[PDB]
Subunit: 440 residues, 4 copies
């Protein structure tokens, strides 16, 4: 799946709809990022710029100008074509091909932006700019506005009003279109196939990073070159570290391994966590913790629908967690009192859910304590976990156990669709899968 030309057009128009007449919105591309010396990390476009363009070059600026309710036009600034630069570092779109390729009305050289931008902002009332996002963008915008302020004898005027467009754009990004949902659905399948593969390949004596290698290879072969975040493979006590990315340890028979990994497919994030036995068989103690996390997930999956919230579903999970932990002797006391004291927090210290999209921890207003009412089109994770520290004052058998199980869902009219259920999570299904792989 992919995002159509028409969809990028619709998004631009949906932003323009919300803009004041006599205004311009300025959306800047991400800068190139150094890895070491003259070498750079693989380019990752700014998510908001990407959202309006699907264009993967640096040194580009989308300018949307609204004259009134029925009159608007777009200007792109982008890199000029340069045979020497293109022989060395790769092909560029240029100005001639840009209007047709990206559906903009006009394309200018980025090298001329300081000569041109003030002319576009001259006489407008409002400029929409995400101030503080990038230093290079702020220099450009401020420089343009100073030219206009100081240029009254050349009959120039600056817009006196500057508005951060991020609240508006992130509110748009919070609600996925059918096209976006289709892309995220594929990202979920890709990510699930990778997690299945990691389970099937895992053996004692392999390193954590070996499973990372399997996962990234699987992402790549479906056309997701990059992960959406740094892959986490925490075996044993490493599972109690939420974003453990060292992935350096030999995986030991008897330990669990926690894998949090997600592909980036057409800009969109998958985000799955599966925890399983390194040797393919859960111990009793491991099952006892696993079952609590699985019940939390399965119950959350049932409950999530329009009209509830992350906060409200979290309350049900806290109850399941505190109850399970009291039965195992990990907590002691009255369940309701323990809940009132948030006695689960030493063992579950993060949120159940986050928004998901062009960023793995996606943009959009959560409301106080993530109390915002859910509506169709919102996409989020469901990731309960229990992390018992190596030195927790609890029965010995639970110490050093970290388990998270995470699915990705989209809120529908009547409930939710699970995008990541094609990778198993019931312990008997995990064991069967691993057994079948070891034979083969």
């Amino acid at each position: 799946s992919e995002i159509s030309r028409q969809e990028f057009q619709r998004r631009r128009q949906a932003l323009v709809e919300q803009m004041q007449p006599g205004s311009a919105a300025l959306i800047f591309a991400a800068p190139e990022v150094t890895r070491s010396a003259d070498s750079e990390y693989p380019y990752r476009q700014n998510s908001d710029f990407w959202y309006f363009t699907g264009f993967n070059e640096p040194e580009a600026v989308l300018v949307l100008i609204k004259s009134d309710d029925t009159h608007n036009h777009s200007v792109l600034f982008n890199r000029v074509r340069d045979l020497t630069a293109e022989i060395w570092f790769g092909r560029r779109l240029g100005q001639d091909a840009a209007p047709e390729k990206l559906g903009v009305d006009r394309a200018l050289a980025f090298s001329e932006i300081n000569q041109q931008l003030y002319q576009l902002l001259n006489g407008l009332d409002v400029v929409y700019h995400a101030q503080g996002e990038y230093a290079y963008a702020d220099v450009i915008v401020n420089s343009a506005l100073e030219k206009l302020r100081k240029g009254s004898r050349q009959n120039l005027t600056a817009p006196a009003t500057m508005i951060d467009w991020r609240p508006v754009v992130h509110e748009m990004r919070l609600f996925k279109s059918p096209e976006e949902i289709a892309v995220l659905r594929r990202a979920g399948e890709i990510t699930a196939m990778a997690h299945t593969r990691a389970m099937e390949k895992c053996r004692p004596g392999m390193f954590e990073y070996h499973l990372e290698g399997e996962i990234h290879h699987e992402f790549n072969r479906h056309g997701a070159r990059y992960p959406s975040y740094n892959t986490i493979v925490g075996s044993g006590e490493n599972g109690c570290i939420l974003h453990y990315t060292e992935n350096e340890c030999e995986m030991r028979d008897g330990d669990l391994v926690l894998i949090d990994a997600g592909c980036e497919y057409k800009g969109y994030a998958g985000d799955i966590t599966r925890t399983f036995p390194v040797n393919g068989k859960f111990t009793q103690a491991q099952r006892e913790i696993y079952d609590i996390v699985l019940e939390s997930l399965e119950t959350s999956l049932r409950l999530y629908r329009p009209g509830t919230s992350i906060l409200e579903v979290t309350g049900e999970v806290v109850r399941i967690m505190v109850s399970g932990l009291v039965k195992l002797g990990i907590l002691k006391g009255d369940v309701d009192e323990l809940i009132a004291q948030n006695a689960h927090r030493p063992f579950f210290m993060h949120g159940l859910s986050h928004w998901l999209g062009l960023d793995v921890h996606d943009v959009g207003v959560y409301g106080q304590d993530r109390s915002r009412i859910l509506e169709p089109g919102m996409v989020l994770t469901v990731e309960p976990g229990l992390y018992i520290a190596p030195d927790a004052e609890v029965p010995e058998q639970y110490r050093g156990i970290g388990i998270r199980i995470e699915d990705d869902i989209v809120i529908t009219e009547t409930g939710n669709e699970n995008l990541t259920a094609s990778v198993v999570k019931k312990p008997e299904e995990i064991e069967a899968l691993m057994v079948a792989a070891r034979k083969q």
Copy 2:
């Protein structure tokens, strides 16, 4: 292989040896680098900081203080231990364990650097600082020196002399120790195994990125998680782009594919290029260009030794290239005149060799036109290539052909050692390998 504790100690002492008495050298860690929103790229330590420490954390500063010819000591600034931060993002060394772990005399909290650094620089004559390397480092250093300048009533004095240590340190990095050569030898083997694998896996109808996926998986399984640079897989006309990294095209029967890829193993770069037929059989036209590049490489490999230079060996390659091209009718005229006119440049527009080490394009003075005399311990690439543009005014059969063949070598007492010869480059050996893989 790896770098020993003792080696890191030797390097620090070799820097201190060259420093003036009453001086301090300040070496800063790389900052963390954003990929998108709150997500960050996998951390890559600054090569110079790494060279003296093997320490892979941000927010760290190595301070080497030389009192005189026989008196010096070291201070590390590094992140304090923080249970919440460590539960979330991973374990930290801290101050208690640092002296023993990294062989420094003293370790302080990085959060106290502004309270502490001026005290360390107070009364010294010279400070060694790589000004302009990092903005955060410059703020810290300048702030310390201002405190000292303005603090004469508190009996403070600033060192009046600031010296860039990079020339000195990069000159050290230019000459590899036996330990470094052993590590680079392993990086070369790992990288070669990956290139062999790409050749064996290649089929028509696969995408360029599929071969990238194979290569990265191979790097990872030998314990090189990351490439040293963004992998290049240019099939067909994409081969004429030197750092083509889009890797997005379906590979076509009849085309060549050029793969430039290198692992990062213990900080050190492999860097191999192999070009081969997608369908496993070179055409006549492809062989005719390939043979010229292979002769250039084989001849360069024979010639490289102490006492020659990149410039001098390049002159021999230019002759081979111009001669081969005249015989094919790609160039026309007298060979010596064509050489004098640099008539090869449209087809070979980069350098034959670059330094290799902790950076793929490694530090160290080349001399004018890379004329510096080679000595034992220098490590460099040997990468002739010919790139015939799709629209070159040459016989049709050569258009759109890009071929590079690149090996990594270390200059020895009597010649060089080739680190990357375990992956084949003779066309008959390439074909045999691919045939054997297709059977299977």
Copy 3:
């Protein structure tokens, strides 16, 4: 005369009237300014901050918060009291006395502004800030807004809208109240007494700076310690330089001297120019140029009234100038054609009038080519001049003559009031004054 407490209150309320509900306006004091090393120039408060406060300290910020149409309050940030700092450098208002002294509701320590400002802006929709005015102010404001943006888990929100209040405030400053007009009236008298004195003291063999000394002494004795701008005393050819401030030359019998000087009284600028003979007697050639400039001024003074403009009155002056210059043989041709060609520009190359107030070249929109229609309450200068370069291709007797005559006026309901007519400008009155002084 002075500005009352009530007037400062009215101005604040007039700004708040124009502000959106759920907004805050931030007005910053001027920074202290270095003259050399640890010594500083006499403090000059920012004109806009002064306009709302009459408060002459640095490190102060006026915050006006509008909740709705009937609810607003003010917060001052200012320097805390400090006995050591006050023994050394002078008394401070502090927080306790500020509410009563400056009629603000609340006063906080400026040293706590970063801990406090974000709390004041939290949850507002709009912030009024003159971005780019001062770097220290921008750091403070941006820092506050970043705290709010990043603090959603602490239930913080930033105002998305930032508005430059300068257009609004400068439009207010453009129209003087009766109190302001009374103060400017006194500034005009003070400045006129100083110019009279300079005429009476002038003798051949005195230096240009001696007349500056007389002028500044006169300003000071009426309680205007500082000039509103750097005093200009251009004798001879120095008169052809518009802002000649070297004032270094011996004044010569036979030359004219041009004095442009103005006091600063309660923040408000006087601005007078008088040109007169060093020896107290105009030559024929000097009179011939002087009379043209005087007619231009006298005619402009008659014409200026509500409904005309600087542009329109300038057109009448250009006609007077071109006509006078043609009669002297300084210009040649048809008067109307010469006017159409702007043939006066080599000799009159600046504007006839500028706004006058808290700045000598005062704030306020002029309109294209200063075409804005004049209304009662606007205060402006009237300063025609003719400057014949030493090397002009004109009759010898006019070369090196610079003459400007400048008055300050306030537009009234029926015309204008001249604030600076208490110093003579008719040549016979100038001569009589100088004669009487020499006896002284």
Copy 4:
């Protein structure tokens, strides 16, 4: 008196003498400084730039290049000539006239400094730069050094060593030449004539600022347009504030007035303090404090010579002060014990002496607690004072009395020369002077 062309030449050569071979010293002019809006404070040249040039323009850079022990040359960057800019704002030196006028070998346009400076620094080993002095200078220098670092393929190299020249230059400035001493001698006379005049003009009912007006007029008429610092006229309790510059109060019969004021003559500072009765007659209580301060000054004047120090002479003053204060009942106890407890500090809380020159508080190393041994050519102030707070717990008659008496001296071979003794300080001579003036 003035500084000769030859002297500026000698100073440049004295700096070059101390520089390493293969080096360049960069000395930048002061930036122009805003007073309000588009108006600027009278230009004050940077003291170090002035010291080497006597050149009073902004946007100028002196570059001194030392090839070896017998080969050096100079390059000036300065503003280009511009008829429009010169008609408006004043004449400029330009490039053609600069070599002859300022004795430099070469003059280039300041607008070309970024195109030219890196070429001058290319291939040098050392650059002398006062980093942090001016932000505009740092941008220029850093930009040049980055061009050189990154330009190795254009055969460019940056000097690796940067040295702050300020310690060296300020050590030069600490020792005045005969020419400088002659200029400072005239500054002292001018300043003394101004203080005499203030005493003669003072009457009850005049304001503090009126005496400022007299002082500045006197400075100006001898050709010292500007004061070296903001003039202090503290009558009554205002005398207990060390740098009281409000000068806003009506001077009252019965009070003392403390005047600290100094001219700037050819860049050099006068610095005199005299305290005297507003009504021309010291009271008993006023005499009792005055006599202690006068004895401190007279004794210090006798003691100051080569081989002593500010610290050592201060110890004698502390003894005089503590003894006088015990006799008046302002202090209580054993004199030696009171001295050991620094019991004088509430009443004398500043230093006895500071260096004097191109800055009023002049450059140069003082040593710990101003213990540096004095040598011929050092110029310094001698300014004991006693400041009894309005609320001091001392006999009523001493409360609110601030007295300082300050002279300027130059250390000679056998003692010192007093530059400011032409204004009276003995109380009977003060009274006689004021009596004679009142008749006026």
